[PDB]
Amino acid sequence: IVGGYTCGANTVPYQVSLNSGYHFCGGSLINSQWVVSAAHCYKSGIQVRLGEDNINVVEGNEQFISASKSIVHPSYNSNTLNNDIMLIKLKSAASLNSRVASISLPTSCASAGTQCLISGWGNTKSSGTSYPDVLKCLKAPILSDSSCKSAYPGQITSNMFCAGYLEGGKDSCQGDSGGPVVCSGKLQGIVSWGSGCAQKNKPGVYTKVCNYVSWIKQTIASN
């Protein structure tokens, strides 16, 4: 995350780290046995780490559980990143506590203007590379579809929204992919893509989760 701050211990308790020997993507816990992340984070052999703050230090608050299965959306397009969502089922149920909580799915979509919290362990340097080890947070608003589409012409679909600041400065970045965008206590977005990180006129693009709630609910119930 660039221009964000250190969240702190368990302030984003639904945050997950996807690990395949190292941390490669983020995710959101939606109930004791399921995690939603981005389809471009699919890898085989995923281990989910819950209650993580520093991904390089075990502080006795974690739960390391392997995935039993992954489901990438039927319409995921890896070229356009349209429908970039995937579900990961956990082998055993995580134990929910103060440090590990699930986030709720929305009943409606959020409006431009709404303030969201974006979190993750991705790069922190726009012009450079720095990978933090503690969780970073960023409060950003949903931008208007017009400001989003003028920034990426012919590339935004109804399944994507933009959030951030056009002045550049703060934004999601490499690593943070798969992570949550929570607005008014609901999981409304998933970090999906952007043009570099925090550049002027280049906000991040997020999967608009409100368009997949019936697919999520149906898929989890039959798997």
Ligand SMILES: NC(=[NH2+])c1ccc2nc[nH]c2c1
């Ligand atoms: N600028 C962004 N918000 C962004 C987020 C995730 C990415 N994954 C590759 N590039 C990315 C860029």
Ligand SMILES: [Ca+2]
């Ligand atoms: Ca740790």
Ligand SMILES: [Cl-]
């Ligand atoms: Cl992350």
Ligand SMILES: [Zn+2]
């Ligand atoms: Zn990350």
Ligand SMILES: [Zn+2]
């Ligand atoms: Zn990515």
